[PDB]
Amino acid sequence: MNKGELVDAVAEKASVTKKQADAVLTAALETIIEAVSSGDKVTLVGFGSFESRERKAREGRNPKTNEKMEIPATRVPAFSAGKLFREKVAPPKA
Amino acid sequence: MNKGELVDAVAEKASVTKKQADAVLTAALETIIEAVSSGDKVTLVGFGSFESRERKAREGRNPKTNEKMEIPATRVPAFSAGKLFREKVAPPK
DNA sequence: TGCTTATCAATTTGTTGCA
DNA sequence: TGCTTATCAATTTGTTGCAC
């Protein structure tokens, strides 16, 4: 499923124009990236959460020269799937 | 930012009602979950992708009893943030 | 787009049951 | 989403640059 296909399904499910599903979806994703980038957590009950995670510096190694090197500290976006998402993907047994 | 707060923000940018932002967002999340649960990859240009990952069985331990246990194989949802998302969080160079 | 070095290395997550 | 086990064990990601 791409963005186009998702819009198709959404426009159908929510009874909005394929434009509007696209309009609202694009703004939603753009907003999530914005909130995460300025360090807010985006929380969507059942689905999951998105946040920025700190990554400390660590050592790597150059595969060409074998030289040890330092990967500097960074931040990365992170997703944690909510309980409904996890259980649809893996229906509980025990 | 929670669901209710994201919907408010998106009704504004797209120029709809709150009720349409919400019904669109809800539909989109349910569709992604369904797509992923059925083994489909959801790929959204300018945001990232969602997919199912296989996890082999592994060893854990019971905190109540201290007995070793086997956590069975399963499937888990995974998100891979797109380049744009990654670069907004951590500007290059 | 893979695939790629290190006898890597910082990281995530799951395991009970109750609050 | 907390604390609460293992002197856990499995994941992921990154390090460079080619065409494997």
Side-chain angles (χ1 to χ4, degrees):
Chain A
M1 193 181 267
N2 55 38
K3 184 185 188 182
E5 269 143 12
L6 177 61
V7 172
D8 282 354
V10 172
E12 284 200 61
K13 283 183 200 189
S15 302
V16 308
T17 293
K18 258 164 188 223
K19 210 166 62 81
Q20 282 174 167
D22 173 69
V24 175
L25 178 73
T26 301
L29 309 172
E30 293 186 348
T31 298
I32 290 165
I33 289 167
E34 252 36 66
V36 168
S37 305
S38 45
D40 205 13
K41 188 172 181 170
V42 181
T43 282
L44 311 166
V45 64
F47 179 80
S49 72
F50 294 90
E51 60 176 12
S52 197
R53 285 192 191 147
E54 297 296 295
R55 289 282 177 277
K56 279 177 173 18
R58 50 201 177 83
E59 284 181 51
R61 197 180 283 281
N62 199 301
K64 308 296 165 151
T65 75
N66 188 238
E67 182 164 339
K68 200 81 189 273
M69 75 192 281
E70 172 144 293
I71 309 161
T74 188
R75 315 164 173 173
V76 295
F79 177 71
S80 307
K83 182 149 173 169
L84 179 84
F85 201 168
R86 294 176 333 242
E87 294 188 341
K88 291 316 272 241
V89 172
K93 176 142 157 224
Chain B
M1 191 185 278
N2 64 35
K3 193 186 175 188
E5 283 165 341
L6 173 58
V7 154
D8 261 276
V10 170
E12 289 311 67
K13 277 162 197 187
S15 263
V16 296
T17 159
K18 287 190 178 181
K19 203 177 86 36
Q20 270 168 184
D22 173 82
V24 165
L25 182 56
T26 298
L29 299 182
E30 296 171 3
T31 297
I32 286 157
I33 283 179
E34 293 291 306
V36 171
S37 300
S38 88
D40 206 350
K41 183 191 210 140
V42 182
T43 293
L44 313 164
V45 194
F47 181 80
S49 61
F50 301 82
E51 77 192 323
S52 198
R53 294 199 176 138
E54 303 285 298
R55 207 94 314 176
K56 293 169 144 58
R58 49 204 191 84
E59 28 207 285
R61 188 175 294 281
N62 199 126
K64 294 291 157 194
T65 63
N66 188 71
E67 190 180 319
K68 260 301 199 77
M69 63 208 287
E70 164 134 302
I71 299 155
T74 188
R75 292 176 198 169
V76 299
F79 177 65
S80 305
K83 277 193 180 63
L84 195 28
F85 203 166
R86 282 183 211 223
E87 281 184 345
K88 290 301 265 302
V89 175
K93 179 108 210 325

mmCIF file of all heavy atoms in Angstrom, chain A residues 18-67:
data_model
loop_
_atom_site.group_PDB
_atom_site.id
_atom_site.type_symbol
_atom_site.label_atom_id
_atom_site.label_comp_id
_atom_site.label_asym_id
_atom_site.label_seq_id
_atom_site.Cartn_x
_atom_site.Cartn_y
_atom_site.Cartn_z
ATOM 1 N N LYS A 18 -11.199 11.915 -2.371
ATOM 2 C CA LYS A 18 -9.822 11.422 -2.500
ATOM 3 C C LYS A 18 -8.806 12.564 -2.319
ATOM 4 O O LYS A 18 -7.723 12.359 -1.760
ATOM 5 C CB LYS A 18 -9.620 10.708 -3.850
ATOM 6 C CG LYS A 18 -9.638 9.174 -3.746
ATOM 7 C CD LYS A 18 -9.836 8.545 -5.130
ATOM 8 C CE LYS A 18 -10.022 7.464 -5.427
ATOM 9 N NZ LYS A 18 -9.348 6.796 -6.574
ATOM 10 N N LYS A 19 -9.162 13.767 -2.777
ATOM 11 C CA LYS A 19 -8.367 14.964 -2.471
ATOM 12 C C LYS A 19 -8.260 15.213 -0.924
ATOM 13 O O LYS A 19 -7.156 15.453 -0.363
ATOM 14 C CB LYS A 19 -8.942 16.206 -3.204
ATOM 15 C CG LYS A 19 -8.020 17.442 -3.686
ATOM 16 C CD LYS A 19 -8.553 18.477 -4.668
ATOM 17 C CE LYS A 19 -9.753 19.233 -4.116
ATOM 18 N NZ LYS A 19 -9.345 20.330 -3.192
ATOM 19 N N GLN A 20 -9.407 15.140 -0.244
ATOM 20 C CA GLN A 20 -9.525 15.536 1.161
ATOM 21 C C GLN A 20 -8.841 14.539 2.041
ATOM 22 O O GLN A 20 -8.191 14.909 3.029
ATOM 23 C CB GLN A 20 -10.988 15.631 1.592
ATOM 24 C CG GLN A 20 -11.709 16.916 1.131
ATOM 25 C CD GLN A 20 -13.188 16.820 1.485
ATOM 26 O OE1 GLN A 20 -13.866 18.035 1.372
ATOM 27 N NE2 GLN A 20 -13.720 15.381 1.882
ATOM 28 N N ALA A 21 -8.997 13.250 1.711
ATOM 29 C CA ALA A 21 -8.281 12.236 2.456
ATOM 30 C C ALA A 21 -6.808 12.531 2.263
ATOM 31 O O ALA A 21 -6.036 12.581 3.251
ATOM 32 C CB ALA A 21 -8.586 10.859 1.949
ATOM 33 N N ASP A 22 -6.411 12.794 1.015
ATOM 34 C CA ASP A 22 -5.007 13.154 0.753
ATOM 35 C C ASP A 22 -4.584 14.435 1.484
ATOM 36 O O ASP A 22 -3.502 14.488 2.066
ATOM 37 C CB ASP A 22 -4.735 13.291 -0.746
ATOM 38 C CG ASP A 22 -3.351 13.836 -1.033
ATOM 39 O OD1 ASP A 22 -2.315 13.174 -0.809
ATOM 40 O OD2 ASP A 22 -3.239 15.005 -1.476
ATOM 41 N N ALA A 23 -5.439 15.454 1.443
ATOM 42 C CA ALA A 23 -5.191 16.718 2.128
ATOM 43 C C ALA A 23 -4.988 16.510 3.633
ATOM 44 O O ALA A 23 -3.970 16.931 4.206
ATOM 45 C CB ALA A 23 -6.342 17.697 1.860
ATOM 46 N N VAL A 24 -5.950 15.840 4.267
ATOM 47 C CA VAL A 24 -5.894 15.620 5.709
ATOM 48 C C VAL A 24 -4.744 14.665 6.087
ATOM 49 O O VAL A 24 -4.033 14.887 7.070
ATOM 50 C CB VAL A 24 -7.262 15.115 6.258
ATOM 51 C CG1 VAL A 24 -7.167 14.767 7.750
ATOM 52 C CG2 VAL A 24 -8.361 16.141 6.013
ATOM 53 N N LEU A 25 -4.536 13.621 5.294
ATOM 54 C CA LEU A 25 -3.436 12.702 5.585
ATOM 55 C C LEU A 25 -2.059 13.389 5.475
ATOM 56 O O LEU A 25 -1.215 13.210 6.351
ATOM 57 C CB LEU A 25 -3.511 11.427 4.731
ATOM 58 C CG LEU A 25 -2.366 10.431 4.926
ATOM 59 C CD1 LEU A 25 -2.469 9.671 6.284
ATOM 60 C CD2 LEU A 25 -2.240 9.466 3.740
ATOM 61 N N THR A 26 -1.840 14.175 4.419
ATOM 62 C CA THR A 26 -0.560 14.855 4.219
ATOM 63 C C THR A 26 -0.266 15.799 5.379
ATOM 64 O O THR A 26 0.848 15.805 5.909
ATOM 65 C CB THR A 26 -0.527 15.604 2.868
ATOM 66 O OG1 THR A 26 -0.737 14.661 1.806
ATOM 67 C CG2 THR A 26 0.866 16.158 2.580
ATOM 68 N N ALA A 27 -1.263 16.577 5.786
ATOM 69 C CA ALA A 27 -1.100 17.475 6.925
ATOM 70 C C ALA A 27 -0.809 16.723 8.223
ATOM 71 O O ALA A 27 -0.069 17.219 9.052
ATOM 72 C CB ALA A 27 -2.303 18.364 7.090
ATOM 73 N N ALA A 28 -1.392 15.532 8.387
ATOM 74 C CA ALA A 28 -1.220 14.716 9.598
ATOM 75 C C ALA A 28 0.213 14.217 9.731
ATOM 76 O O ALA A 28 0.830 14.352 10.795
ATOM 77 C CB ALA A 28 -2.212 13.546 9.604
ATOM 78 N N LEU A 29 0.747 13.672 8.635
ATOM 79 C CA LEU A 29 2.129 13.211 8.580
ATOM 80 C C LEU A 29 3.116 14.360 8.709
ATOM 81 O O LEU A 29 4.135 14.217 9.377
ATOM 82 C CB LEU A 29 2.393 12.445 7.287
ATOM 83 C CG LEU A 29 1.403 11.324 6.947
ATOM 84 C CD1 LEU A 29 1.684 10.785 5.547
ATOM 85 C CD2 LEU A 29 1.407 10.225 7.993
ATOM 86 N N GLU A 30 2.825 15.495 8.071
ATOM 87 C CA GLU A 30 3.710 16.657 8.167
ATOM 88 C C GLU A 30 3.754 17.187 9.603
ATOM 89 O O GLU A 30 4.819 17.596 10.083
ATOM 90 C CB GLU A 30 3.320 17.770 7.173
ATOM 91 C CG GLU A 30 3.531 17.402 5.702
ATOM 92 C CD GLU A 30 3.271 18.550 4.727
ATOM 93 O OE1 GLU A 30 2.702 19.607 5.121
ATOM 94 O OE2 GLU A 30 3.639 18.386 3.539
ATOM 95 N N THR A 31 2.601 17.171 10.273
ATOM 96 C CA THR A 31 2.476 17.572 11.677
ATOM 97 C C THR A 31 3.217 16.654 12.626
ATOM 98 O O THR A 31 3.860 17.120 13.563
ATOM 99 C CB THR A 31 0.996 17.638 12.085
ATOM 100 O OG1 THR A 31 0.326 18.630 11.296
ATOM 101 C CG2 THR A 31 0.839 18.158 13.538
ATOM 102 N N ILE A 32 3.130 15.342 12.388
ATOM 103 C CA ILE A 32 3.842 14.387 13.213
ATOM 104 C C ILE A 32 5.351 14.639 13.154
ATOM 105 O O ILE A 32 6.005 14.697 14.191
ATOM 106 C CB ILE A 32 3.520 12.926 12.783
ATOM 107 C CG1 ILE A 32 2.079 12.574 13.148
ATOM 108 C CG2 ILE A 32 4.510 11.965 13.453
ATOM 109 C CD1 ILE A 32 1.543 11.277 12.450
ATOM 110 N N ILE A 33 5.888 14.793 11.942
ATOM 111 C CA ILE A 33 7.316 15.054 11.738
ATOM 112 C C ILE A 33 7.746 16.337 12.451
ATOM 113 O O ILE A 33 8.813 16.385 13.063
ATOM 114 C CB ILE A 33 7.609 15.112 10.210
ATOM 115 C CG1 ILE A 33 7.503 13.721 9.576
ATOM 116 C CG2 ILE A 33 8.940 15.738 9.918
ATOM 117 C CD1 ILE A 33 7.476 13.740 8.055
ATOM 118 N N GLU A 34 6.899 17.361 12.388
ATOM 119 C CA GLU A 34 7.116 18.655 13.049
ATOM 120 C C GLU A 34 7.162 18.554 14.582
ATOM 121 O O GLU A 34 8.060 19.106 15.223
ATOM 122 C CB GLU A 34 6.015 19.639 12.636
ATOM 123 C CG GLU A 34 6.471 20.747 11.696
ATOM 124 C CD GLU A 34 7.495 20.590 10.623
ATOM 125 O OE1 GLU A 34 7.878 20.104 9.540
ATOM 126 O OE2 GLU A 34 8.140 21.460 11.239
ATOM 127 N N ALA A 35 6.186 17.870 15.166
ATOM 128 C CA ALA A 35 6.113 17.700 16.617
ATOM 129 C C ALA A 35 7.278 16.857 17.129
ATOM 130 O O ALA A 35 7.853 17.150 18.167
ATOM 131 C CB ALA A 35 4.764 17.048 17.010
ATOM 132 N N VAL A 36 7.621 15.791 16.400
ATOM 133 C CA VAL A 36 8.748 14.949 16.803
ATOM 134 C C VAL A 36 10.083 15.715 16.701
ATOM 135 O O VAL A 36 10.900 15.655 17.616
ATOM 136 C CB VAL A 36 8.757 13.602 16.046
ATOM 137 C CG1 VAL A 36 10.115 12.836 16.239
ATOM 138 C CG2 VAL A 36 7.560 12.739 16.483
ATOM 139 N N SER A 37 10.273 16.452 15.608
ATOM 140 C CA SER A 37 11.490 17.251 15.369
ATOM 141 C C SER A 37 11.776 18.332 16.405
ATOM 142 O O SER A 37 12.941 18.715 16.611
ATOM 143 C CB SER A 37 11.478 17.851 13.945
ATOM 144 O OG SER A 37 11.313 16.790 12.985
ATOM 145 N N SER A 38 10.730 18.843 17.047
ATOM 146 C CA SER A 38 10.914 19.842 18.095
ATOM 147 C C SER A 38 10.803 19.194 19.466
ATOM 148 O O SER A 38 10.703 19.881 20.467
ATOM 149 C CB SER A 38 9.926 21.008 17.935
ATOM 150 O OG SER A 38 8.608 20.567 17.669
ATOM 151 N N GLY A 39 10.802 17.860 19.492
ATOM 152 C CA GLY A 39 10.902 17.092 20.721
ATOM 153 C C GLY A 39 9.613 16.787 21.459
ATOM 154 O O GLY A 39 9.649 16.431 22.629
ATOM 155 N N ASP A 40 8.470 16.923 20.797
ATOM 156 C CA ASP A 40 7.233 16.446 21.387
ATOM 157 C C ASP A 40 7.000 14.967 21.042
ATOM 158 O O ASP A 40 7.527 14.457 20.046
ATOM 159 C CB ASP A 40 6.045 17.304 20.954
ATOM 160 C CG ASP A 40 4.893 17.255 21.959
ATOM 161 O OD1 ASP A 40 5.005 16.778 23.123
ATOM 162 O OD2 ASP A 40 3.782 17.728 21.608
ATOM 163 N N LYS A 41 6.252 14.275 21.898
ATOM 164 C CA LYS A 41 5.849 12.894 21.642
ATOM 165 C C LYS A 41 4.465 12.918 21.033
ATOM 166 O O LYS A 41 3.577 13.588 21.559
ATOM 167 C CB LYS A 41 5.832 12.093 22.945
ATOM 168 C CG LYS A 41 5.606 10.575 22.791
ATOM 169 C CD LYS A 41 5.826 9.895 24.155
ATOM 170 C CE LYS A 41 5.634 8.384 24.082
ATOM 171 N NZ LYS A 41 6.083 7.726 25.352
ATOM 172 N N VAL A 42 4.278 12.202 19.920
ATOM 173 C CA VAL A 42 2.960 12.075 19.319
ATOM 174 C C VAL A 42 2.362 10.743 19.758
ATOM 175 O O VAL A 42 2.936 9.682 19.549
ATOM 176 C CB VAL A 42 2.952 12.210 17.772
ATOM 177 C CG1 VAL A 42 1.507 12.097 17.242
ATOM 178 C CG2 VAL A 42 3.557 13.532 17.321
ATOM 179 N N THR A 43 1.204 10.826 20.385
ATOM 180 C CA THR A 43 0.598 9.671 21.016
ATOM 181 C C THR A 43 -0.774 9.385 20.378
ATOM 182 O O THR A 43 -1.637 10.255 20.312
ATOM 183 C CB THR A 43 0.470 9.966 22.520
ATOM 184 O OG1 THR A 43 1.750 9.792 23.144
ATOM 185 C CG2 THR A 43 -0.401 8.921 23.193
ATOM 186 N N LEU A 44 -0.963 8.171 19.896
ATOM 187 C CA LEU A 44 -2.218 7.813 19.269
ATOM 188 C C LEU A 44 -2.703 6.501 19.872
ATOM 189 O O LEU A 44 -2.227 5.447 19.496
ATOM 190 C CB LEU A 44 -2.040 7.719 17.743
ATOM 191 C CG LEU A 44 -1.343 8.897 17.043
ATOM 192 C CD1 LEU A 44 -0.924 8.524 15.636
ATOM 193 C CD2 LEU A 44 -2.229 10.164 17.017
ATOM 194 N N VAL A 45 -3.624 6.571 20.829
ATOM 195 C CA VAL A 45 -4.017 5.393 21.601
ATOM 196 C C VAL A 45 -4.418 4.202 20.704
ATOM 197 O O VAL A 45 -5.224 4.352 19.768
ATOM 198 C CB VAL A 45 -5.142 5.714 22.602
ATOM 199 C CG1 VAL A 45 -6.406 6.129 21.787
ATOM 200 C CG2 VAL A 45 -5.568 4.511 23.507
ATOM 201 N N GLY A 46 -3.814 3.041 20.982
ATOM 202 C CA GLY A 46 -4.067 1.811 20.250
ATOM 203 C C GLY A 46 -3.138 1.597 19.077
ATOM 204 O O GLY A 46 -2.708 0.462 18.803
ATOM 205 N N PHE A 47 -2.806 2.686 18.393
ATOM 206 C CA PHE A 47 -1.953 2.633 17.214
ATOM 207 C C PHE A 47 -0.484 2.648 17.602
ATOM 208 O O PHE A 47 0.263 1.728 17.275
ATOM 209 C CB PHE A 47 -2.266 3.784 16.262
ATOM 210 C CG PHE A 47 -1.405 3.791 15.031
ATOM 211 C CD1 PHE A 47 -1.698 2.948 13.949
ATOM 212 C CD2 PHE A 47 -0.282 4.616 14.964
ATOM 213 C CE1 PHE A 47 -0.893 2.946 12.815
ATOM 214 C CE2 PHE A 47 0.534 4.622 13.847
ATOM 215 C CZ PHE A 47 0.240 3.783 12.772
ATOM 216 N N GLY A 48 -0.061 3.726 18.257
ATOM 217 C CA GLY A 48 1.296 3.800 18.753
ATOM 218 C C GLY A 48 1.740 5.223 18.999
ATOM 219 O O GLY A 48 0.949 6.164 18.860
ATOM 220 N N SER A 49 3.012 5.372 19.357
ATOM 221 C CA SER A 49 3.581 6.688 19.615
ATOM 222 C C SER A 49 4.859 6.892 18.810
ATOM 223 O O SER A 49 5.584 5.940 18.489
ATOM 224 C CB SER A 49 3.874 6.854 21.098
ATOM 225 O OG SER A 49 4.986 6.052 21.443
ATOM 226 N N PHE A 50 5.129 8.156 18.521
ATOM 227 C CA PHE A 50 6.305 8.600 17.803
ATOM 228 C C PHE A 50 7.040 9.595 18.695
ATOM 229 O O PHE A 50 6.413 10.467 19.293
ATOM 230 C CB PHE A 50 5.905 9.367 16.542
ATOM 231 C CG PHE A 50 5.213 8.535 15.494
ATOM 232 C CD1 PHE A 50 3.823 8.410 15.506
ATOM 233 C CD2 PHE A 50 5.946 7.944 14.462
ATOM 234 C CE1 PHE A 50 3.163 7.677 14.527
ATOM 235 C CE2 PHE A 50 5.300 7.203 13.473
ATOM 236 C CZ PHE A 50 3.915 7.064 13.508
ATOM 237 N N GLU A 51 8.361 9.464 18.767
ATOM 238 C CA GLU A 51 9.165 10.385 19.535
ATOM 239 C C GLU A 51 10.588 10.463 19.010
ATOM 240 O O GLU A 51 10.991 9.679 18.167
ATOM 241 C CB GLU A 51 9.157 10.007 21.016
ATOM 242 C CG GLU A 51 9.689 8.629 21.339
ATOM 243 C CD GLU A 51 9.725 8.399 22.824
ATOM 244 O OE1 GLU A 51 9.132 9.207 23.568
ATOM 245 O OE2 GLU A 51 10.363 7.430 23.250
ATOM 246 N N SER A 52 11.309 11.471 19.479
ATOM 247 C CA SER A 52 12.716 11.623 19.204
ATOM 248 C C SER A 52 13.476 10.863 20.311
ATOM 249 O O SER A 52 13.134 10.960 21.485
ATOM 250 C CB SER A 52 13.041 13.117 19.220
ATOM 251 O OG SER A 52 14.267 13.393 18.595
ATOM 252 N N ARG A 53 14.486 10.088 19.928
ATOM 253 C CA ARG A 53 15.333 9.409 20.891
ATOM 254 C C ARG A 53 16.767 9.888 20.757
ATOM 255 O O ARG A 53 17.279 10.000 19.647
ATOM 256 C CB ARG A 53 15.248 7.893 20.711
ATOM 257 C CG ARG A 53 13.929 7.375 21.267
ATOM 258 C CD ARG A 53 13.814 5.889 21.428
ATOM 259 N NE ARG A 53 12.424 5.548 21.726
ATOM 260 C CZ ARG A 53 11.822 4.434 21.349
ATOM 261 N NH1 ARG A 53 12.483 3.532 20.635
ATOM 262 N NH2 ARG A 53 10.547 4.222 21.682
ATOM 263 N N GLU A 54 17.400 10.173 21.892
ATOM 264 C CA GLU A 54 18.812 10.515 21.915
ATOM 265 C C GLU A 54 19.630 9.273 21.644
ATOM 266 O O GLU A 54 19.276 8.177 22.088
ATOM 267 C CB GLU A 54 19.227 11.144 23.247
ATOM 268 C CG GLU A 54 18.541 12.457 23.567
ATOM 269 C CD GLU A 54 18.868 13.583 22.586
ATOM 270 O OE1 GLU A 54 20.042 14.020 22.513
ATOM 271 O OE2 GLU A 54 17.947 14.048 21.894
ATOM 272 N N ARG A 55 20.690 9.445 20.862
ATOM 273 C CA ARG A 55 21.691 8.400 20.618
ATOM 274 C C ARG A 55 23.051 8.964 21.012
ATOM 275 O O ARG A 55 23.469 9.975 20.467
ATOM 276 C CB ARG A 55 21.692 8.009 19.135
ATOM 277 C CG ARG A 55 20.445 7.225 18.667
ATOM 278 C CD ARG A 55 20.504 5.789 19.079
ATOM 279 N NE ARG A 55 19.329 4.986 18.734
ATOM 280 C CZ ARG A 55 18.209 4.930 19.454
ATOM 281 N NH1 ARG A 55 18.074 5.674 20.555
ATOM 282 N NH2 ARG A 55 17.215 4.125 19.059
ATOM 283 N N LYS A 56 23.710 8.338 21.988
ATOM 284 C CA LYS A 56 25.063 8.700 22.406
ATOM 285 C C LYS A 56 26.047 8.422 21.285
ATOM 286 O O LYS A 56 25.778 7.566 20.430
ATOM 287 C CB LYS A 56 25.485 7.816 23.588
ATOM 288 C CG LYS A 56 24.976 8.238 24.949
ATOM 289 C CD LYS A 56 25.437 7.200 25.984
ATOM 290 C CE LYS A 56 25.110 7.646 27.424
ATOM 291 N NZ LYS A 56 24.057 8.725 27.493
ATOM 292 N N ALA A 57 27.190 9.097 21.318
ATOM 293 C CA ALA A 57 28.308 8.772 20.446
ATOM 294 C C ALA A 57 28.696 7.331 20.667
ATOM 295 O O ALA A 57 28.567 6.814 21.787
ATOM 296 C CB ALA A 57 29.500 9.649 20.743
ATOM 297 N N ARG A 58 29.177 6.683 19.608
ATOM 298 C CA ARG A 58 29.730 5.342 19.719
ATOM 299 C C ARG A 58 30.825 5.114 18.697
ATOM 300 O O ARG A 58 30.987 5.875 17.749
ATOM 301 C CB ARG A 58 28.648 4.271 19.553
ATOM 302 C CG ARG A 58 27.783 4.419 18.365
ATOM 303 C CD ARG A 58 26.454 3.692 18.506
ATOM 304 N NE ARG A 58 25.590 3.920 17.357
ATOM 305 C CZ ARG A 58 25.678 3.241 16.220
ATOM 306 N NH1 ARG A 58 26.587 2.271 16.083
ATOM 307 N NH2 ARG A 58 24.839 3.516 15.225
ATOM 308 N N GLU A 59 31.599 4.069 18.913
ATOM 309 C CA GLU A 59 32.691 3.781 18.019
ATOM 310 C C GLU A 59 32.192 2.885 16.892
ATOM 311 O O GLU A 59 31.359 2.002 17.099
ATOM 312 C CB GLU A 59 33.827 3.122 18.786
ATOM 313 C CG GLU A 59 34.749 4.135 19.743
ATOM 314 C CD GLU A 59 35.896 3.458 20.480
ATOM 315 O OE1 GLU A 59 36.686 2.744 19.828
ATOM 316 O OE2 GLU A 59 36.012 3.643 21.708
ATOM 317 N N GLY A 60 32.624 3.196 15.680
ATOM 318 C CA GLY A 60 32.450 2.300 14.562
ATOM 319 C C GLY A 60 33.819 1.982 14.005
ATOM 320 O O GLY A 60 34.853 2.261 14.625
ATOM 321 N N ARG A 61 33.827 1.404 12.816
ATOM 322 C CA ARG A 61 35.059 1.052 12.133
ATOM 323 C C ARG A 61 34.840 1.232 10.644
ATOM 324 O O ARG A 61 33.796 0.838 10.115
ATOM 325 C CB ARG A 61 35.417 -0.393 12.430
ATOM 326 C CG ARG A 61 36.846 -0.767 12.120
ATOM 327 C CD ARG A 61 37.158 -2.205 12.423
ATOM 328 N NE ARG A 61 37.338 -2.413 13.858
ATOM 329 C CZ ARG A 61 38.442 -2.109 14.519
ATOM 330 N NH1 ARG A 61 39.486 -1.586 13.876
ATOM 331 N NH2 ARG A 61 38.516 -2.348 15.825
ATOM 332 N N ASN A 62 35.833 1.838 9.993
ATOM 333 C CA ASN A 62 35.877 2.033 8.547
ATOM 334 C C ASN A 62 36.151 0.693 7.825
ATOM 335 O O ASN A 62 37.199 0.099 8.042
ATOM 336 C CB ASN A 62 36.979 3.061 8.247
ATOM 337 C CG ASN A 62 36.857 3.700 6.871
ATOM 338 O OD1 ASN A 62 36.877 3.020 5.840
ATOM 339 N ND2 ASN A 62 36.773 5.021 6.851
ATOM 340 N N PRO A 63 35.233 0.214 6.974
ATOM 341 C CA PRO A 63 35.378 -1.118 6.363
ATOM 342 C C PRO A 63 36.481 -1.177 5.322
ATOM 343 O O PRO A 63 36.990 -2.271 5.020
ATOM 344 C CB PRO A 63 34.018 -1.382 5.705
ATOM 345 C CG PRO A 63 33.320 -0.119 5.685
ATOM 346 C CD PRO A 63 34.004 0.892 6.532
ATOM 347 N N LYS A 64 36.853 -0.010 4.802
ATOM 348 C CA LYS A 64 37.881 0.079 3.782
ATOM 349 C C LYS A 64 39.280 0.135 4.384
ATOM 350 O O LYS A 64 40.182 -0.563 3.926
ATOM 351 C CB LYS A 64 37.621 1.279 2.864
ATOM 352 C CG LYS A 64 36.204 1.319 2.278
ATOM 353 C CD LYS A 64 35.913 0.118 1.356
ATOM 354 C CE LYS A 64 34.404 0.012 1.124
ATOM 355 N NZ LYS A 64 34.051 -0.589 -0.193
ATOM 356 N N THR A 65 39.445 0.947 5.424
ATOM 357 C CA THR A 65 40.754 1.178 6.027
ATOM 358 C C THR A 65 40.970 0.413 7.338
ATOM 359 O O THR A 65 42.094 0.368 7.846
ATOM 360 C CB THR A 65 40.998 2.693 6.248
ATOM 361 O OG1 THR A 65 40.224 3.150 7.365
ATOM 362 C CG2 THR A 65 40.452 3.525 5.086
ATOM 363 N N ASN A 66 39.902 -0.174 7.880
ATOM 364 C CA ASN A 66 39.939 -0.867 9.173
ATOM 365 C C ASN A 66 40.135 0.069 10.371
ATOM 366 O O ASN A 66 40.220 -0.376 11.509
ATOM 367 C CB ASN A 66 41.004 -1.972 9.172
ATOM 368 C CG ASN A 66 40.950 -2.837 10.412
ATOM 369 O OD1 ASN A 66 41.934 -2.949 11.167
ATOM 370 N ND2 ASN A 66 39.801 -3.460 10.635
ATOM 371 N N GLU A 67 40.194 1.367 10.107
ATOM 372 C CA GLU A 67 40.446 2.345 11.148
ATOM 373 C C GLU A 67 39.239 2.507 12.063
ATOM 374 O O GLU A 67 38.091 2.601 11.603
ATOM 375 C CB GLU A 67 40.844 3.676 10.520
ATOM 376 C CG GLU A 67 41.196 4.781 11.505
ATOM 377 C CD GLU A 67 41.937 5.947 10.857
ATOM 378 O OE1 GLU A 67 42.533 5.762 9.765
ATOM 379 O OE2 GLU A 67 41.915 7.056 11.443
#
